[PDB]
Amino acid sequence: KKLNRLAHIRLKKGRDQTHEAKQKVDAYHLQLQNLLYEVMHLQKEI
Amino acid sequence: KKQILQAKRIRKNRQEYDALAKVIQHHETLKELEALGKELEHLSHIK
């Protein structure tokens, strides 16, 4: 029982850290997408 | 930035082309002159 509880808690912590990393990567990707949209619109206007 | 320079060049070219188009606006003429010559020939025959 103690081993199962420890494993479940570790899995929850790992999933939380992965979700945090996913949010960070999504923010970076949104910044990069804004930059690419700016470049595309500037090439379209020019 | 290079594309902005190129767009400035293209805008200068478009301004020159618009100046040319406005200067021109400021085959059909030969056909109108031929019709006027035919009308003058008909008027000479009537006279």
Under 8 Å CB pairs connecting chains A and B tally to 8
**Hey, how many other C-beta atoms are within 10 angstroms of the C-beta on B7?**
15
Q: What sections of chain B are H helices per DSSP?
A: 2-25, 28-46
**Structure token pair of residue A34:** 């804004």
Cα separation, B21 vs B13, in Å, equals 12
> Measured between alpha carbons, how far is residue B40 from residues B9, B27, B28, B35, B47 in Å?
52, 20, 18, 9, 10
Give the CA angle between residues A33, A37, A40 to the nearest 5°: 135
CB contact under 8 A, B7 and A45: yes
Report the amino acid identity of residue A37. Answer: Y
A46 to chain B: which residues are within 8 Å by CB? 3-4, 6-7
Resolution (A): 3.5
Report the amino acid identity of residue A3. Answer: L
Cα separation, A35 vs B43, in Å, equals 75
Q: Which of B3, B9, B10, B11 to mutate to test the interface with A (most CBs of A within 10 A)?
A: B3
Instruction: State which approach was used to obtain the coordinates.
Output: cryo-EM
